[PDB]
Ligand binder design. Sequence first.
Ligand SMILES: *[C@@H]1O[C@H](CO)[C@@H](O[C@@H]2O[C@H](CO)[C@@H](O)[C@H](O)[C@H]2NC(C)=O)[C@H](O)[C@H]1NC(C)=O
Ligand code: NAG
Lengths: 400, 400, 400, 400, 400
Amino acid sequence: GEFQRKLYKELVKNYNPLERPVANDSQPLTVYFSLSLLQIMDVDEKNQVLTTNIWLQMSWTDHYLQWNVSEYPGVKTVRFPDGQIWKPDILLYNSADERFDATFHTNVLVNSSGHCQYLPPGIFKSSCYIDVRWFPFDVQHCKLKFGSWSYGGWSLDLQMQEADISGYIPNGEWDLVGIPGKRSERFYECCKEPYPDVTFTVTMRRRTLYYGLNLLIPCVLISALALLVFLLPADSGEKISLGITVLLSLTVFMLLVAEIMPATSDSVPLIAQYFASTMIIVGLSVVVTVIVLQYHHHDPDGGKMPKWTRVILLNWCAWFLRMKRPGDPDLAKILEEVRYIANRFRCQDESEAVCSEWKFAACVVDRLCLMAFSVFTIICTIGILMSAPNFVEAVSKDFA
Amino acid sequence: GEFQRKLYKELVKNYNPLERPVANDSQPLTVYFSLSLLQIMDVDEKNQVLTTNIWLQMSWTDHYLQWNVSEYPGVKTVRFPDGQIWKPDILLYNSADERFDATFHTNVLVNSSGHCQYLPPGIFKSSCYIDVRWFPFDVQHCKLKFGSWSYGGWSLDLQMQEADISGYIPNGEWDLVGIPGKRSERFYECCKEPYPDVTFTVTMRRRTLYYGLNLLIPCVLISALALLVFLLPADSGEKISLGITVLLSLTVFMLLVAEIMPATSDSVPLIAQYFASTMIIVGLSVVVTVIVLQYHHHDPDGGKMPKWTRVILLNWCAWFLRMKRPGDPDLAKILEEVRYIANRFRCQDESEAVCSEWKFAACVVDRLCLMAFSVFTIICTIGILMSAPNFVEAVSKDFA
Amino acid sequence: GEFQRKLYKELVKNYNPLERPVANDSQPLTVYFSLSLLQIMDVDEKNQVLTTNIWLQMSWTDHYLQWNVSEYPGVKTVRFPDGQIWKPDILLYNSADERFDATFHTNVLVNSSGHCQYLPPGIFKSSCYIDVRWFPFDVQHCKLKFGSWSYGGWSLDLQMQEADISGYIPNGEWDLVGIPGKRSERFYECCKEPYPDVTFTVTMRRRTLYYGLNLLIPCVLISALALLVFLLPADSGEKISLGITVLLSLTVFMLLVAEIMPATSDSVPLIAQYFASTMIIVGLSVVVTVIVLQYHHHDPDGGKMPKWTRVILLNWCAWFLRMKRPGDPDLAKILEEVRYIANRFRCQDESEAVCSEWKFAACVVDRLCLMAFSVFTIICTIGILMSAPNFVEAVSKDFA
Amino acid sequence: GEFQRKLYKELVKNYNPLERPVANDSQPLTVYFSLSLLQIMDVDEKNQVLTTNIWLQMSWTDHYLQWNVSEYPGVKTVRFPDGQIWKPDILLYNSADERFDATFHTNVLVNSSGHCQYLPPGIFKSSCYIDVRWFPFDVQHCKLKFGSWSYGGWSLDLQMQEADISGYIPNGEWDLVGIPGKRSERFYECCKEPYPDVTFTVTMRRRTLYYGLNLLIPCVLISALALLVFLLPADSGEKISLGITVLLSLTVFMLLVAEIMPATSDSVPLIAQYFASTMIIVGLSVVVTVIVLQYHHHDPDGGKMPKWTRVILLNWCAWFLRMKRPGDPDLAKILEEVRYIANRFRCQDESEAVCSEWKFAACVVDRLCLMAFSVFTIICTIGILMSAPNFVEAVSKDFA
Amino acid sequence: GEFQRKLYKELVKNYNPLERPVANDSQPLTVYFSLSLLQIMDVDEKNQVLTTNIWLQMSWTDHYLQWNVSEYPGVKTVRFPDGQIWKPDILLYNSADERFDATFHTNVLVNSSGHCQYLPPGIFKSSCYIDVRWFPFDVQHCKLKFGSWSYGGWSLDLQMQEADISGYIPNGEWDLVGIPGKRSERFYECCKEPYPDVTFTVTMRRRTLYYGLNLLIPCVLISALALLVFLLPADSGEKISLGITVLLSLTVFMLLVAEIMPATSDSVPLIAQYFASTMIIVGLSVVVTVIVLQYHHHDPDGGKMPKWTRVILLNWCAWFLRMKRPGDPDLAKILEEVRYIANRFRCQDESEAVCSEWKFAACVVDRLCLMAFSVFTIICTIGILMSAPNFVEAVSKDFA
Ligand SMILES: *[C@@H]1O[C@H](CO)[C@@H](O[C@@H]2O[C@H](CO)[C@@H](O)[C@H](O)[C@H]2NC(C)=O)[C@H](O)[C@H]1NC(C)=O
Ligand SMILES: *[C@@H]1O[C@H](CO)[C@@H](O)[C@H](O)[C@H]1NC(C)=O
């Protein structure tokens, strides 16, 4: 329309997009900065990069773009594209993107009295420290530091406003706790003028159902199945097979859990501690199994049972678990030969009795070690799992 | 020729690409927004993004771009590139692309009356909630929300035309159900004006043939193979090995499925429920076979058959299972020797009889557990695979 | 020089790089389109995209860039950069690249008569259907569609020239069959004018040496080696281990093909069919192994071999495979002792005779199942691998 | 400075950055081309691409950028960015990059006499055929082709200056053998006009220490350890398990090897034709092991030993292998009893004496197969490894 | 601001950005260079690139941009965007980035006296040599070279200032040692002029609390577990499956290292040689186990046990290890029968004695090899891990 065309013609005349639009040059300009969180796109632990989808919200008061609505009755707002009017150079300080700026430049809406608005969208990839001390029951804080680049404290007075999360889209993996802001002034080696900035901290918790189902239960079940090696009779000859197969099935689980953890050498992750505990438990199980097997296949007439070991295993423990311990010249020549045969059979019987005693000792040792290892694995698993803070709150929220 | 040269020269005289091509500056400019789907490039599970090939469709009216075709014989349309005439700024609200506007800026075709046609293509990536509760029998609703970034409703009212699917090349994985669109107005606290926008919700159904044949069939087959551990006679001495090897080979499939799955924590997918159930079945089979091997290699002496086991295993279950249970002085001296040998044989016969009874008990337990486990695995697999809705429709449309 | 400087100054005076350079503004402008294939660098089956190195080729006639060479001694051609002269807007319709136009922009060579040439290179990513029904004996067709985005047929008409393949660098995986095309004229319900376009279909055939030597051969070898479980005497005690280990190994092997196969439910791939066949074979082999081991460790007391099974396994099949069937009162007390011992030994001999008969039955079953399984696997593998078309052509052109 | 300001103002007066800065418009402009290799970033076998780091060097002469130094005392050189002056358009004819021209555009240095220089750096990706026939002892020849895209031969004649490698940083896994070049001319069917071009063929050799110590040695060690199946006594009962475990480990090893090799079907790579040999060796090892286990667990009732087998195994080989080859009325009732017992014992002795020959035959065949496989695997591996060209040079340089 | 507008119009009147802002035109322009390090985001070893977050600190003096603050009350600074004033060109010479300059072009701050200030951030990807001969106890020195691309020493003398790490953010994987710099010159055969440059060398140390626990502890624990084959009695029958499965489980660590380790061939990494040593130890253990099994299941009637073997094993090793080795005519017919049976038992006893001797020899050789292998493995592990610099520093700084 004629009025809009005339207004656009008049506004740009003798306008310089390089000057700060203030009435008095000494007085700093006031800029209000806020944010509008929409979605946490990704939280990467290996690269420590947080990917978010937010809308910047900055508003100020231009002085030259003021007009009387009487002269132009139709038009009440004017929109200027990028590169025609002055805009604050607010940008992220700790960006991790290949290009340091990741804001899509949109139009700037202008009041009938100079109050400008600017709502650029964009997907921001910032760098924040990720803590894996209590994985996967951890809460992460990541900061977004915004501030003008080449404007001091006496030129651009940066103010702060509360972040808006009304349109937030809930994420499956993480649930948002809050996002408070803070404003501060800083000094730099470059210059002697303070540079204010606005910092937003995003506090989020990790939902633990997926990990608690695919990382903790299967390993516990496999360890419990490894504890069965202390029930197979020695004659089966499969205890070693069972032990090594379990060790392999946990080596592959070690690989799978290592594929995701970052190389941060600052703290030992909870899951790493617990997996290690399972490693040594299974290894000691294999060692005890070897000892038991070497007890069971003890060659008779090649040693004697030590008195201490005998009186311990066959009596003290047997009472403890109430397991009862098992158990004419031709005529003369014929006579002596049958005595020889009978004596051979008697020697065989004595050797069999000694072997039975050795096997019973092996069985008692096996039962004792089963009890000890079972109690040990329960106590260690429970202690490591419950050591982490907020564990009960997290499990209650995620499960019931 | 000279006619279109003169027309192009005179159409840009006192033209501002910053104004709104209206005639009263108090009547909103009507823009008709539509769509044209061509192909679904990708449906990412872990990233929760949707990649589609879309042509937009915008159409409005320009008041200044009008000419009499009588005075310009031959020319009926003109084309203007980007940045030369005013264009509506309509962009995808929810875009998962580092650049927030993935649109190729083509020309604008203008009729003599003044109609402007704009059809920019582009590969759009949008973030939508992907439901995984019913994997792989999935029906997903992903949304596309379009609207003007700056103009409101006093100036631009977005209408709708039905989304067109005519060049849509069918995808080999995702069936297309529909793509409806609704145009809704949203009011603000300030000003009683609408803010129209058009949203399109693509609805796709996942074809299940590939995932079925490659995941469901092999895991069911190996789970059935795990049941064969109940038919191997204990004397073979290789019963544990089959169980552990099956468990390992199936944990491999579990890792694969996990690597395909997202990491959400709002629900337990079907493919996770079924895998966990099969885990439990195989573990219970291993426990049972350890029990049976314990029964089989039972030392005859030093143990007695409990009353309960005697009164159950060999008489009740066998009847319920139709199992038949199997069961001078030199003369004196040589007499004592031969009677000693005979008594030795008598004792051996008694011991082997007791051992045979133990072995029969083991066989009975094997058969009973085989029947029980077969029934339980059939029931569990059928229940889990039939719980999901639209499963009958999925099989009907994919396997036949 | 000076003449070319003067000519450059004269050629751009009153010239609008926005109008179609025609002499009547009512007749179409003839534009010739052609291709030049250089190299095919990636055929991605997962996302069904094709990556090629292509030089376009356009030519037309401009009515404003003409001069008398005799007037400008020495100047015969003039090159204009992008954006300074009118160009046809021909872009590929079905692109799979984030930027819809992945074409480097070069200069336009202009002859003294007004002719223009334009050979812009660029790597094109195109979305085409990749049929996988007959992997890896595969022949693919992928289409490329080029046409004007905005100009119609009253103004622009394309004329095809034959695709040129002279610099085509052969690929190590795909051989080229040809690249034909056809001019097409789309008509509208609008009004009687064509909309010319040129489309090229690239035909390629996968070379099967690598896949034949890396997948089809090792899996056949493993399946054949699984048949050795039928030559292992049961006394070894390591029969089930061999079969289960072979099963585990090949189901691990299946991951390599699983990671290349796309998730298409249109048809069942040939390689997937053949792997499923090998799975059925190995599973049934393990089942038969369990049956044999059951038949071999048979209790001689509780059971007698049925008449039918005897007459089928001991004479009929024995002849059908030509295997022979293997095979004072002190004196009184002494007499009773010795006859007791003799009767005990006689009973032992009868028991071992029955056991030997059972073991022979197991051996006959094992031999018969070996023969049956060998025939079944060879027949199935040959049928599956020969069911594919152009299989003789593939094995004649790749291996030989 | 005033003088340089004046000169900058003068040099652009009436200067069209579109014309060849020649003096006669007839003779061509001689342009000198060269290169400056810095490092070889990566050589990709899978995609057949080469990424490098080079500095293009160009030089020519201008007829308009000349001035008298005595009139501008302080100025000797000037710099013009892209777009102000004429620059030759030289770019790779074979670039495997989405942008067909990856050169960072820097300034142009101009002397007082008019000479110009231009050194744009950039990371160049080129598509060169990469032979793989002799992996890992390989020598590659990748070509870079540079030439003007639009100017011909009467207008712009290239020259060649030998490539410069002085700041070259050696790669960790490639040895630069050289980088020659030569100038070639081409003609069209039009008219006798040379089309000069410059091409560089960088030749590189792969250092093989890492591959030799990572692949060749462990595979050989596993293959050699697979021969230990021929030292195990048959009574251990774990002769099969070692063979199958070796086969499984080497299958996963060959998958690890093949996940990096390109899928080319022009020739069989050395590493593949060596891994196939190892596969065949282990397969026949398992076959022979099955044969031995069949010969050893032979029932001494189902036939005899053929005379041919006797004379070939226990008569000839046993000598050749230098191994020793082992091997009152009641009185009548008592008589019958002892006669029966002794006859049973004699029958048992005959049976075991018969089985001893079968056990010896198994031992002899095992020794013979050990010798055969031990010689054959060594011969095969040494032939395959030493069959490659430049193997002696590779091993000498990379190990001494 | 009226004064701001007036000064902005005044400062760009006849100002050529192409000219150096000096007032003599024959003197160099002093430029102060520095750098501010924020984070070390990535240290890639496979591609040997380093990613850092860096600010530059360019600074110079402009002769033309001076004004009197008295005549412009209030204005103290002005900011110019890219392309409006002269900016020195400083490129990172060794840049492994697709774009040869990944710097965000921010504003230039100018004081009243004319001093400029340019601090453009950007994420840089330098290329450095990653020495890996001491993995994971590693210390690296990547360099960073900066310099003017087209200015020499007569025109631009580049000074240096110390780097700024006051805002450094620690990385969990690397420990920063320091970052020195050196401003050096260079001459040419042309003419005696310097070419100043500033080179920053980044020294970082890897923290090993992660690798030392994930690849150093599990490997040594598995190696120790591999020695249990010398405590397992041979009667078990599972004496070599343990070792072969330990080898199977050990291959995965090699694959993990290969996927982490680069492909360089200039040395052998410490961890690579350590794992090679461990696999050699395990293979030798398997060979020795085969020897023991062969010595244990020895045929008694197969050969006299060698005198050397006696005088070694049964004479010296028994003492050294302190182990004691185990250990009417009717009546005539009756006589003959009992004599036959008695002699049969005598011969059986002799065979048993020989077998027991052989078994004891096997046991003693097993004990001896256990001792030797344990000593060898501890010596090898300690020597390999301690034959590396800064190992004591690494442990005392990380594990404490
Ligand atoms: C300006 O730069 C050019 C660089 O090529 C100079 O040309 C060369 O200068 C050296 C020194 O005398 C001569 O040896 C070469 O023969 C010249 N090259 C050619 C093709 O002639 C040129 O002399 C310089 N001019 C001034 C005034 O410095
Ligand atoms: C701007 O502010 C300062 C301080 O209040 C004042 O001295 C000056 O007069 C103001 N400018 C004008 C034009 O009044």
